[PDB]
Scaffold this active site. Structure first.
Site, PDB file in Angstrom:
ATOM      1  N   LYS A 223      30.807 -16.361 -71.777  1.00 18.99           N
ATOM      2  CA  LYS A 223      29.446 -15.810 -71.925  1.00 18.99           C
ATOM      3  C   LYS A 223      28.670 -16.566 -72.993  1.00 18.99           C
ATOM      4  O   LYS A 223      28.098 -15.973 -73.912  1.00 18.99           O
ATOM      5  CB  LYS A 223      29.518 -14.324 -72.258  1.00 18.99           C
ATOM      6  CG  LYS A 223      30.077 -13.483 -71.119  1.00 18.99           C
ATOM      7  CD  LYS A 223      28.989 -13.041 -70.152  1.00 18.99           C
ATOM      8  CE  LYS A 223      29.587 -12.321 -68.947  1.00 18.99           C
ATOM      9  NZ  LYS A 223      28.589 -11.464 -68.252  1.00 18.99           N
TER      10      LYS A 223
ATOM     11  N   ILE B 280      24.795 -17.901 -77.225  1.00 15.84           N
ATOM     12  CA  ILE B 280      25.276 -16.756 -76.464  1.00 15.84           C
ATOM     13  C   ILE B 280      24.458 -16.538 -75.182  1.00 15.84           C
ATOM     14  O   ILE B 280      23.253 -16.769 -75.152  1.00 15.84           O
ATOM     15  CB  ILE B 280      25.339 -15.458 -77.322  1.00 15.84           C
ATOM     16  CG1 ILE B 280      23.994 -15.145 -77.965  1.00 15.84           C
ATOM     17  CG2 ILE B 280      26.416 -15.593 -78.404  1.00 15.84           C
ATOM     18  CD1 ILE B 280      23.868 -13.699 -78.421  1.00 15.84           C
ATOM     19  N   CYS B 281      25.155 -16.151 -74.117  1.00 13.55           N
ATOM     20  CA  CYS B 281      24.518 -15.779 -72.849  1.00 13.55           C
ATOM     21  C   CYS B 281      24.266 -14.305 -72.939  1.00 13.55           C
ATOM     22  O   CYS B 281      25.178 -13.517 -72.762  1.00 13.55           O
ATOM     23  CB  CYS B 281      25.413 -16.071 -71.647  1.00 13.55           C
ATOM     24  SG  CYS B 281      25.641 -17.826 -71.356  1.00 13.55           S
ATOM     25  N   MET B 282      23.035 -13.937 -73.257  1.00 13.39           N
ATOM     26  CA  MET B 282      22.682 -12.525 -73.405  1.00 13.39           C
ATOM     27  C   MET B 282      22.544 -11.860 -72.047  1.00 13.39           C
ATOM     28  O   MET B 282      22.530 -12.541 -71.026  1.00 13.39           O
ATOM     29  CB  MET B 282      21.396 -12.382 -74.199  1.00 13.39           C
ATOM     30  CG  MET B 282      21.578 -12.815 -75.612  1.00 13.39           C
ATOM     31  SD  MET B 282      19.923 -12.763 -76.564  1.00 13.39           S
ATOM     32  CE  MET B 282      20.428 -13.870 -78.090  1.00 13.39           C
TER      33      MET B 282
END
Length: 157
Positions: free
Chosen positions: A104, A111-113
């Site tokens: 993620k 970060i992949c929110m």
């Protein structure tokens, strides 16, 4: 509590990003006012979870964030720059120590929110700021991923 925490974060009034001279300074004042209130609220509910500094221009931010799991503290270095098209574009938050520890995450430890974050941001421009990115973006990301990593064995006390 997440939704109601956010309901007590001060909103911002000024549509300006870093290129906008005096309006950026006015925007930053609101950013600081929102952040301070959010931190005080977090401290009074004993849920303080980050410490942030920035350069004087307010365009590069750095510090740490942390989460508790099984009664133990996990703390991480974090950083983000404020895009020149802020507040339309939210900043991208990096936790460089976590690269390769979770899927993620993309190029640069960013970060992949959540999918839900971006539409929520887009329709609340310019009333949301950094405090909201942390509360709606980084906070939830930590609460879901850190337990995974602690349990997978990449993280210890």
């Amino acid at each position: 509590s997440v939704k109601e925490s956010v309901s007590r974060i001060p909103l911002l009034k000024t549509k300006a990003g870093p290129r906008d001279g005096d309006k950026w300074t006015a925007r930053l004042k609101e950013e600081y006012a929102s952040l301070i209130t959010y931190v005080e609220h977090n401290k009074a509910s004993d849920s303080h979870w980050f410490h942030l500094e920035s350069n004087p221009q307010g365009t590069r931010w750095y510090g740490t964030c942390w989460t508790y799991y099984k009664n133990e503290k996990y703390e991480f270095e974090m950083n983000f720059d404020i895009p020149v098209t802020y507040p339309q574009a939210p900043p991208e938050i990096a936790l460089p120590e976590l690269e390769g520890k979770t899927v993620k995450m993309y190029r640069g430890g960013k970060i992949c929110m959540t999918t839900h974050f971006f539409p929520l941001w887009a329709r609340n421009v310019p009333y949301f700021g950094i405090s909201h990115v942390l509360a709606l973006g980084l906070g939830p990301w930590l609460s879901i991923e850190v337990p995974a990593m602690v349990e997978e064995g990449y993280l210890k006390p």
